């Protein structure tokens, strides 16, 4: 009854950060060896848990969040961080329990001429609460009034990432999967 | 909200669209410069039209956020760079013609050929070919043919284009409330930040001219000495009280006298401080030259070159059918993409240049931390100076010996010290008057002090008076000799190479004191001092975020060009020079010319 981590990690399409997607994993056997003995993850940080002991742990449910960010924003997918990704797109709680995994995807996700399909939100009134999501696409104004561009002081809140095959590493696309481990007073459904 | 809050969000909009548009422009320029094709010229012109159109609309919008009502200096400085636009203020037809002039002038220069009279089938480009003659030839006639043939084939074409260029460039400057295009260029040194850290455009002329007065005695002696030693190589062509013929100065313009070193070395039986032959004999290639420069920067704590640098750069002429523009340049294309375009030869000059260009990259890499509008040098001279601090160390006998280019039994005496100082002087002191005199001429053309009818009269009058150099052939107003230099034909300001040379030694004096060096600063090798690299990286990472007067005062003690470190660096060669010239004439007569004989 093996756990379907290959459908999350090896998915063809990934989504943008602002519109990040979540798969619920339950009633399965979770063999994390497919993850931790592998070369390709540039980021493999665990919180409240030890990567090496993953196969001994049991949980109520595990949650997998997929999206894509710049190399220089992978540092924002961590508890306690700030910036556009952590504030306006994807916010981890401080008591986060789980692992963040990212790998370089310039081969799949960047082009010679430039790939603009992945977006992120860079303007918002107020920060996100943890695990909250905002897919609204409403023009942003600092006064907070409704406005319509092209008017002054009025801006579309989603920016395109620009992913080119020749850029520096901090500007290259990275796929990110965030595994949350959930401890409820319920029985356990995901184990090693 | 506050006008400060509106402009912070306006800037955040600006930064995200500009990062994209300037990246596409940089990419389109790279492919043209790396692969000159009609298709790539059109692609370059279009991407730059999108960048220019963007940039100018954002300048207009930035004005609605008035500077006086913002209190955060970082935003205030980001908006200041946006307040003055460029050529957008011109008529569409008018800016059409000026963009055409700049593209023609640039490809005339890179496509120009001059043909041998004795062999009409042998037609030579500037690079490589005419340059090879002007660097390695010792025949008066061969060099004269190349020198005159260059100024006659492409100089003569550029002349009508240069006239239209000044009238339009000045119309664009005055439309932006500058006196002239020269005033516009001096704006780069303008500093209005804090109190006591103020610098105006007009002070740059006073300061350039005051410091050039202090350099001139050392140069007159360097001049007297190389004039004496060229009479050994060109007997019956050199007048011992005259200006030096301009085609015999070691390159196409006499910009650097470094290739006179062979003809002027004082103690030539000593181990050669010019390691060009040692590089060839050890089968160095362009890669090795760039790896050694990378090794240097790593030893002082600066980062290694990115992996994309090694994959994307053009470090030698490709020779696969592509036409390239060979002028060495370091590109920050944006998005962390750092590249160098250079047709590298196995030469100590290109060894030193590769350090020079890597310093550009290193600067661009450090101020990447700054916001987009602020990621540039403090001024243009700072930017051309970071590279030359590295050359100052990398060229020392000490460093050469540790790199393997000098034998392990090599020892420094007073004779190798004069050798090394004299070669440094040919490059660094020889170029000051050439640089000063060129921008003086440029500044005077844009101002109106030199009319079209006297452009070449005043160029060769200023060459003789200021540089002590004289034209081998009379030149009418049909000519346009200054446009035969790459930087003039390609609309770049030149004073950076003057301020850089004075900055060089101010930086070097300060980093050596941090490296706890004892003795004269020409013996100083910054190599392996992480403390020195830490001090430098602190200024590099600041970018344009502080005024250049403060940025200078934070590494070195002063807040302005000081020529004292440059003169100390050359104090032993200067005393030596005076003695070699004790029974000789120091200075020049402007009257004699090779053709009035
Ligand atoms: C140098 O530039 C030429 C012209 O832009 C490049 O050629 C074109 O290549 C692209 C991609 O292969 C084609 O889609 C075009 O149709 C080609 N056009 C022509 C006229 O050939 C060439 O590939 C470049 N060379 C290098 C080495 O970068
Ligand atoms: C994804 O695919 C590769 C085989 O192409 C495999 O090695 C890997 O284990 C798969 N699953 C995960 C979760 O990476
Ligand atoms: C820098 O350090 C290395 C390591 O010992 C040494 O081999 C090299 O000679 C040093 N260079 C200088 C100029 O001190």
Coordinates of N, CA, C and O in Angstrom, one line a residue, chain B residues 239-381:
Chain B
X239 N 63.3 63.4 -33.4 CA 64.0 64.7 -33.0 C 64.1 64.8 -31.5 O 63.1 64.8 -30.8
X240 N 65.3 64.9 -31.0 CA 65.5 64.8 -29.5 C 64.9 65.9 -28.7 O 64.9 65.9 -27.5
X241 N 64.4 67.0 -29.4 CA 63.6 68.0 -28.7 C 62.2 68.2 -29.1 O 61.5 69.1 -28.8
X242 N 61.7 67.2 -29.9 CA 60.4 67.3 -30.5 C 59.4 66.4 -29.9 O 59.6 65.6 -29.0
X243 N 58.2 66.5 -30.4 CA 57.1 65.6 -30.1 C 57.4 64.2 -30.7 O 58.1 64.1 -31.7
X244 N 56.8 63.2 -30.1 CA 57.0 61.8 -30.6 C 56.1 61.5 -31.8 O 54.9 61.8 -31.6
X245 N 56.6 61.0 -32.9 CA 55.7 60.6 -33.9 C 54.5 59.7 -33.4 O 54.8 58.7 -32.7
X246 N 53.3 59.9 -33.8 CA 52.1 59.2 -33.2 C 51.9 57.8 -33.7 O 51.2 57.1 -33.0
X247 N 52.6 57.4 -34.7 CA 52.5 56.0 -35.2 C 53.6 55.1 -34.6 O 53.6 54.0 -35.0
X248 N 54.4 55.7 -33.7 CA 55.5 54.9 -33.2 C 55.3 54.7 -31.7 O 56.3 54.4 -31.0
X249 N 54.1 54.9 -31.2 CA 53.9 54.9 -29.8 C 53.5 53.5 -29.1 O 53.3 53.5 -27.9
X250 N 53.4 52.5 -29.9 CA 53.1 51.2 -29.4 C 51.7 50.7 -29.5 O 51.4 49.5 -29.2
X251 N 50.7 51.5 -29.9 CA 49.4 51.0 -30.3 C 48.8 52.0 -31.4 O 49.5 52.9 -31.8
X252 N 47.6 51.7 -31.8 CA 47.0 52.5 -32.9 C 46.9 54.0 -32.6 O 46.9 54.8 -33.5
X253 N 46.8 54.3 -31.3 CA 46.6 55.7 -30.9 C 47.7 56.3 -30.0 O 47.7 57.5 -29.8
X254 N 48.6 55.4 -29.4 CA 49.4 55.9 -28.3 C 48.6 56.1 -27.1 O 48.9 56.9 -26.2
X255 N 47.5 55.3 -26.9 CA 46.8 55.3 -25.7 C 47.6 54.7 -24.5 O 47.5 55.2 -23.4
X256 N 48.3 53.7 -24.8 CA 49.2 53.1 -23.8 C 50.6 52.9 -24.4 O 50.7 52.5 -25.6
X257 N 51.6 53.2 -23.7 CA 53.0 53.0 -24.2 C 53.5 51.6 -23.8 O 54.8 51.4 -23.9
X258 N 52.7 50.7 -23.4 CA 53.2 49.5 -22.8 C 54.1 48.7 -23.8 O 55.0 48.0 -23.4
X259 N 53.8 48.7 -25.1 CA 54.6 48.0 -26.1 C 55.8 48.6 -26.5 O 56.5 48.1 -27.4
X260 N 56.2 49.8 -25.9 CA 57.5 50.4 -26.0 C 58.4 49.7 -25.0 O 59.6 50.0 -25.1
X261 N 57.9 48.8 -24.1 CA 58.7 48.3 -23.1 C 60.0 47.7 -23.6 O 61.1 47.9 -23.1
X262 N 59.9 46.8 -24.6 CA 61.0 46.2 -25.2 C 62.1 47.2 -25.7 O 63.3 47.0 -25.5
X263 N 61.6 48.3 -26.2 CA 62.5 49.3 -26.8 C 63.1 50.3 -25.7 O 63.9 51.1 -26.1
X264 N 62.6 50.2 -24.5 CA 62.9 51.2 -23.4 C 63.3 50.6 -22.1 O 63.6 51.4 -21.2
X265 N 63.3 49.3 -22.0 CA 63.7 48.6 -20.7 C 65.1 49.1 -20.4 O 66.0 49.1 -21.2
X266 N 65.3 49.4 -19.1 CA 66.7 49.9 -18.7 C 67.7 48.8 -18.5 O 68.8 48.8 -19.1
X267 N 67.3 47.7 -17.8 CA 68.1 46.6 -17.5 C 67.5 45.4 -18.2 O 66.8 44.6 -17.5
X268 N 67.9 45.1 -19.4 CA 67.3 44.0 -20.2 C 67.9 42.7 -20.0 O 67.3 41.7 -20.5
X269 N 69.0 42.6 -19.4 CA 69.6 41.3 -19.1 C 69.0 40.6 -17.9 O 69.1 39.4 -17.7
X270 N 68.2 41.4 -17.1 CA 67.6 40.9 -15.9 C 66.4 40.0 -16.4 O 65.9 40.0 -17.5
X271 N 65.9 39.1 -15.4 CA 64.7 38.3 -15.8 C 63.5 39.2 -16.2 O 63.2 40.2 -15.5
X272 N 62.9 38.9 -17.3 CA 61.9 39.7 -17.9 C 60.7 39.8 -17.0 O 60.0 38.9 -16.8
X273 N 60.5 41.1 -16.5 CA 59.2 41.5 -15.8 C 58.0 41.4 -16.7 O 56.9 41.4 -16.2
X274 N 58.2 41.3 -18.1 CA 57.1 41.1 -19.0 C 57.0 39.6 -19.3 O 57.9 39.0 -20.1
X275 N 56.1 38.9 -18.7 CA 56.0 37.5 -18.6 C 55.3 36.9 -19.9 O 54.9 35.7 -19.8
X276 N 55.2 37.7 -20.9 CA 54.5 37.2 -22.1 C 55.3 36.0 -22.7 O 54.7 35.0 -23.1
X277 N 56.6 36.0 -22.7 CA 57.4 34.8 -23.3 C 57.3 33.6 -22.3 O 57.2 32.5 -22.8
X278 N 57.4 33.9 -21.0 CA 57.2 32.8 -20.1 C 55.8 32.2 -20.2 O 55.6 31.0 -20.0
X279 N 54.7 33.0 -20.5 CA 53.4 32.4 -20.6 C 53.4 31.5 -21.8 O 52.9 30.3 -21.7
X280 N 53.9 31.9 -23.0 CA 53.9 31.1 -24.2 C 54.7 29.8 -24.0 O 54.3 28.7 -24.4
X281 N 55.9 29.9 -23.3 CA 56.8 28.7 -23.1 C 56.2 27.7 -22.2 O 56.6 26.5 -22.2
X282 N 55.2 28.1 -21.4 CA 54.5 27.1 -20.5 C 53.1 26.8 -21.0 O 52.2 26.3 -20.3
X283 N 52.8 27.1 -22.3 CA 51.6 26.6 -23.0 C 50.4 27.1 -22.3 O 49.4 26.4 -22.2
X284 N 50.4 28.3 -21.7 CA 49.2 28.9 -21.2 C 48.2 29.1 -22.3 O 48.6 29.4 -23.4
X285 N 46.9 29.0 -22.0 CA 45.8 29.4 -22.9 C 44.9 30.4 -22.3 O 45.1 30.8 -21.1
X286 N 43.9 30.9 -23.0 CA 43.0 31.9 -22.4 C 42.3 31.4 -21.2 O 42.1 32.1 -20.2
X287 N 42.0 30.1 -21.2 CA 41.3 29.5 -20.0 C 42.2 29.7 -18.8 O 41.8 30.2 -17.7
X288 N 43.5 29.3 -18.9 CA 44.4 29.4 -17.8 C 44.5 30.8 -17.3 O 44.6 31.1 -16.1
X289 N 44.6 31.8 -18.2 CA 44.7 33.2 -17.8 C 43.5 33.6 -17.0 O 43.6 34.3 -16.0
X290 N 42.3 33.1 -17.4 CA 41.1 33.5 -16.6 C 41.0 32.7 -15.3 O 40.5 33.2 -14.3
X291 N 41.5 31.5 -15.3 CA 41.5 30.7 -14.0 C 42.5 31.3 -13.0 O 42.2 31.4 -11.8
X292 N 43.6 31.8 -13.5 CA 44.6 32.4 -12.6 C 44.0 33.7 -11.9 O 44.2 34.0 -10.7
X293 N 43.3 34.5 -12.7 CA 42.6 35.7 -12.2 C 41.6 35.3 -11.2 O 41.4 36.0 -10.1
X294 N 40.8 34.3 -11.5 CA 39.8 33.8 -10.5 C 40.5 33.4 -9.3 O 40.1 33.7 -8.1
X295 N 41.7 32.7 -9.4 CA 42.4 32.2 -8.2 C 42.8 33.4 -7.3 O 42.7 33.3 -6.1
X296 N 43.2 34.5 -8.0 CA 43.6 35.7 -7.2 C 42.5 36.2 -6.4 O 42.6 36.3 -5.2
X297 N 41.3 36.4 -7.0 CA 40.2 37.0 -6.3 C 39.7 36.1 -5.1 O 39.4 36.5 -4.0
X298 N 39.7 34.8 -5.3 CA 39.4 33.8 -4.3 C 40.4 34.0 -3.1 O 40.0 33.9 -1.9
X299 N 41.7 34.2 -3.4 CA 42.7 34.3 -2.3 C 42.4 35.5 -1.4 O 42.9 35.5 -0.2
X300 N 41.8 36.6 -1.9 CA 41.5 37.7 -1.1 C 40.0 37.7 -0.5 O 39.6 38.6 0.2
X301 N 39.3 36.6 -0.7 CA 38.0 36.4 -0.1 C 36.8 36.6 -1.0 O 35.7 36.2 -0.7
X302 N 37.1 37.3 -2.2 CA 36.0 37.5 -3.1 C 35.5 36.1 -3.7 O 36.3 35.2 -3.7
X303 N 34.3 36.0 -4.2 CA 33.7 34.8 -4.7 C 34.4 34.3 -5.9 O 35.1 35.0 -6.7
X304 N 34.2 33.0 -6.2 CA 34.6 32.5 -7.5 C 33.6 32.9 -8.6 O 32.5 33.4 -8.3
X305 N 34.0 32.8 -9.9 CA 33.1 33.1 -11.0 C 32.0 32.0 -11.0 O 32.2 30.8 -10.8
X306 N 30.8 32.5 -11.4 CA 29.6 31.6 -11.5 C 29.9 30.5 -12.5 O 30.7 30.6 -13.4
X307 N 29.1 29.4 -12.4 CA 29.2 28.4 -13.5 C 28.7 28.9 -14.8 O 29.3 28.6 -15.8
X308 N 27.7 29.8 -14.8 CA 27.2 30.4 -16.0 C 28.2 31.3 -16.7 O 28.3 31.3 -18.0
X309 N 29.0 32.0 -15.9 CA 30.2 32.7 -16.5 C 31.1 31.8 -17.4 O 31.4 32.2 -18.5
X310 N 31.4 30.6 -16.9 CA 32.4 29.7 -17.7 C 31.7 29.2 -19.0 O 32.4 28.9 -20.0
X311 N 30.4 29.0 -19.0 CA 29.6 28.5 -20.1 C 29.2 29.5 -21.1 O 29.2 29.2 -22.3
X312 N 28.9 30.7 -20.7 CA 28.3 31.7 -21.6 C 29.3 32.8 -22.1 O 29.1 33.3 -23.2
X313 N 30.4 33.0 -21.4 CA 31.4 34.0 -21.8 C 32.0 33.6 -23.1 O 32.0 32.5 -23.5
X314 N 32.5 34.6 -23.9 CA 33.4 34.5 -25.0 C 34.8 34.9 -24.6 O 35.1 36.1 -24.6
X315 N 35.7 33.9 -24.3 CA 37.0 34.2 -23.8 C 38.1 34.3 -24.9 O 39.2 34.8 -24.6
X316 N 37.8 33.7 -26.1 CA 38.7 33.9 -27.3 C 37.8 34.2 -28.5 O 36.6 33.9 -28.5
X317 N 38.4 34.8 -29.5 CA 37.7 34.9 -30.8 C 37.2 33.5 -31.2 O 38.0 32.5 -31.0
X318 N 36.0 33.4 -31.6 CA 35.5 32.0 -31.9 C 36.1 31.4 -33.1 O 36.3 30.2 -33.2
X319 N 36.4 32.2 -34.2 CA 36.9 31.6 -35.4 C 36.1 30.5 -36.0 O 36.7 29.6 -36.7
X320 N 34.8 30.5 -35.8 CA 33.9 29.6 -36.5 C 33.0 30.3 -37.5 O 31.8 29.9 -37.7
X321 N 33.5 31.3 -38.2 CA 32.8 32.1 -39.2 C 32.1 33.3 -38.6 O 31.8 34.2 -39.4
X322 N 31.8 33.3 -37.3 CA 31.1 34.5 -36.7 C 32.1 35.7 -36.7 O 33.2 35.6 -36.3
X323 N 31.5 36.9 -37.0 CA 32.2 38.1 -36.8 C 31.8 38.6 -35.4 O 30.7 38.7 -35.0
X324 N 32.8 39.0 -34.6 CA 32.7 39.4 -33.3 C 33.2 40.9 -33.2 O 34.1 41.3 -34.0
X325 N 32.7 41.6 -32.2 CA 33.4 42.9 -31.8 C 34.3 42.5 -30.7 O 33.9 42.0 -29.6
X326 N 35.6 42.8 -30.9 CA 36.6 42.2 -30.0 C 37.0 43.0 -28.8 O 37.7 42.6 -27.9
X327 N 36.4 44.2 -28.7 CA 36.8 45.1 -27.6 C 36.4 44.4 -26.3 O 35.3 44.1 -26.0
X328 N 37.4 44.1 -25.4 CA 37.1 43.5 -24.1 C 36.1 44.2 -23.3 O 36.1 45.4 -23.1
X329 N 35.1 43.5 -22.8 CA 34.0 44.1 -22.0 C 33.5 43.0 -21.0 O 33.5 41.8 -21.3
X330 N 33.1 43.5 -19.8 CA 32.5 42.7 -18.8 C 31.0 43.0 -18.7 O 30.6 44.2 -18.4
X331 N 30.1 42.0 -18.9 CA 28.7 42.3 -18.9 C 28.0 41.8 -17.6 O 28.2 40.6 -17.2
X332 N 27.2 42.6 -17.1 CA 26.1 42.3 -16.1 C 24.8 42.3 -16.9 O 24.2 43.3 -17.1
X333 N 24.5 41.1 -17.5 CA 23.2 41.1 -18.2 C 22.0 41.1 -17.3 O 20.8 41.1 -17.9
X334 N 22.1 41.1 -16.0 CA 21.0 41.0 -15.1 C 20.6 39.5 -14.8 O 21.1 38.6 -15.4
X335 N 19.8 39.3 -13.7 CA 19.4 38.0 -13.3 C 20.6 37.1 -13.0 O 20.6 35.9 -13.3
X336 N 21.6 37.7 -12.4 CA 22.8 37.0 -12.0 C 23.7 36.5 -13.1 O 24.6 35.7 -12.9
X337 N 23.4 36.9 -14.4 CA 24.1 36.4 -15.6 C 25.3 37.3 -15.8 O 25.1 38.5 -16.2
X338 N 26.5 36.8 -15.5 CA 27.7 37.6 -15.6 C 28.6 37.0 -16.7 O 28.8 35.8 -16.7
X339 N 29.1 37.8 -17.6 CA 29.9 37.3 -18.7 C 31.0 38.2 -19.1 O 31.0 39.4 -18.8
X340 N 32.0 37.7 -19.8 CA 33.1 38.5 -20.3 C 33.2 38.2 -21.8 O 33.1 37.0 -22.2
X341 N 33.3 39.2 -22.6 CA 33.6 39.1 -24.1 C 35.0 39.6 -24.3 O 35.2 40.8 -24.2
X342 N 35.9 38.7 -24.8 CA 37.3 39.1 -25.0 C 37.9 38.2 -26.0 O 37.7 37.0 -25.9
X343 N 38.7 38.7 -26.9 CA 39.4 37.9 -27.8 C 40.8 37.8 -27.3 O 41.8 38.5 -27.6
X344 N 41.0 36.9 -26.3 CA 42.2 36.8 -25.5 C 43.3 36.1 -26.2 O 43.2 35.0 -26.8
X345 N 44.5 36.8 -26.2 CA 45.7 36.3 -26.7 C 46.6 35.9 -25.5 O 46.4 36.4 -24.4
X346 N 47.7 35.1 -25.8 CA 48.6 34.7 -24.7 C 49.6 35.8 -24.5 O 50.7 35.8 -25.2
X347 N 49.3 36.8 -23.7 CA 50.1 38.1 -23.5 C 49.9 38.6 -22.1 O 48.9 38.4 -21.5
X348 N 51.0 39.2 -21.6 CA 50.9 39.8 -20.3 C 49.8 40.9 -20.3 O 49.2 41.1 -19.2
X349 N 49.7 41.6 -21.4 CA 48.6 42.6 -21.5 C 47.2 42.0 -21.3 O 46.4 42.5 -20.5
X350 N 46.9 40.9 -22.0 CA 45.7 40.3 -21.9 C 45.5 39.5 -20.5 O 44.4 39.4 -20.0
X351 N 46.6 39.1 -20.0 CA 46.6 38.6 -18.6 C 46.2 39.7 -17.6 O 45.3 39.4 -16.8
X352 N 46.7 40.9 -17.8 CA 46.4 42.0 -16.9 C 44.9 42.4 -17.2 O 44.2 42.7 -16.3
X353 N 44.6 42.5 -18.5 CA 43.2 42.9 -18.8 C 42.2 41.9 -18.2 O 41.1 42.3 -17.7
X354 N 42.5 40.6 -18.3 CA 41.6 39.6 -17.7 C 41.4 39.9 -16.2 O 40.3 39.6 -15.7
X355 N 42.4 40.3 -15.5 CA 42.1 40.8 -14.2 C 41.3 42.0 -14.2 O 40.4 42.2 -13.3
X356 N 41.5 42.9 -15.1 CA 40.7 44.2 -15.1 C 39.2 43.9 -15.3 O 38.4 44.4 -14.5
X357 N 38.9 43.0 -16.3 CA 37.5 42.7 -16.5 C 36.9 41.9 -15.4 O 35.7 42.1 -15.0
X358 N 37.7 40.9 -14.8 CA 37.1 40.2 -13.7 C 36.8 41.1 -12.5 O 35.8 40.8 -11.8
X359 N 37.5 42.2 -12.4 CA 37.1 43.1 -11.3 C 35.8 43.8 -11.6 O 35.0 44.1 -10.7
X360 N 35.5 44.1 -12.9 CA 34.2 44.6 -13.2 C 33.1 43.6 -12.7 O 32.2 43.9 -11.9
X361 N 33.2 42.3 -13.2 CA 32.3 41.3 -12.8 C 32.2 41.3 -11.2 O 31.1 41.3 -10.7
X362 N 33.3 41.2 -10.6 CA 33.3 41.2 -9.1 C 32.5 42.3 -8.5 O 31.8 42.1 -7.5
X363 N 32.7 43.5 -9.1 CA 31.9 44.6 -8.6 C 30.4 44.4 -8.8 O 29.6 44.4 -7.9
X364 N 30.0 44.0 -10.1 CA 28.6 43.7 -10.4 C 28.1 42.6 -9.5 O 26.9 42.6 -9.2
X365 N 28.9 41.6 -9.2 CA 28.4 40.5 -8.3 C 28.1 41.0 -6.9 O 27.2 40.5 -6.3
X366 N 28.9 42.0 -6.4 CA 28.7 42.4 -5.1 C 27.5 43.3 -4.9 O 26.8 43.2 -3.9
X367 N 27.3 44.3 -5.8 CA 26.2 45.2 -5.6 C 24.9 44.6 -6.1 O 23.9 45.3 -6.2
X368 N 24.9 43.3 -6.5 CA 23.6 42.6 -6.8 C 22.7 42.7 -5.6 O 21.4 42.6 -5.8
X369 N 23.2 42.8 -4.4 CA 22.4 42.9 -3.1 C 21.6 44.2 -3.1 O 20.5 44.2 -2.4
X370 N 22.0 45.2 -3.9 CA 21.3 46.5 -3.9 C 20.0 46.5 -4.7 O 19.9 45.6 -5.6
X371 N 19.1 47.4 -4.5 CA 17.9 47.5 -5.4 C 18.3 47.9 -6.8 O 19.3 48.6 -7.0
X372 N 17.5 47.5 -7.7 CA 17.8 47.5 -9.2 C 18.4 48.9 -9.6 O 19.4 49.0 -10.2
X373 N 17.7 50.0 -9.2 CA 18.1 51.3 -9.7 C 19.5 51.7 -9.1 O 20.1 52.6 -9.7
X374 N 19.9 51.0 -8.1 CA 21.1 51.4 -7.4 C 22.3 50.5 -7.7 O 23.4 50.6 -7.0
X375 N 22.1 49.5 -8.5 CA 23.2 48.5 -8.8 C 24.0 49.0 -10.0 O 23.9 48.5 -11.1
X376 N 24.9 49.9 -9.7 CA 25.9 50.5 -10.6 C 27.1 50.9 -9.7 O 27.0 51.0 -8.5
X377 N 28.2 51.3 -10.3 CA 29.3 51.9 -9.6 C 29.0 53.2 -9.0 O 28.0 53.9 -9.3
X378 N 29.7 53.6 -7.9 CA 29.6 54.9 -7.3 C 29.7 56.0 -8.3 O 29.0 57.0 -8.3
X379 N 30.8 55.9 -9.1 CA 30.9 56.7 -10.3 C 31.5 55.7 -11.3 O 31.9 54.6 -11.0
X380 N 31.7 56.2 -12.6 CA 32.3 55.4 -13.6 C 33.7 55.1 -13.3 O 34.2 54.0 -13.6
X381 N 34.4 56.0 -12.7 CA 35.9 55.8 -12.4 C 36.1 54.7 -11.4 O 37.0 53.9 -11.6

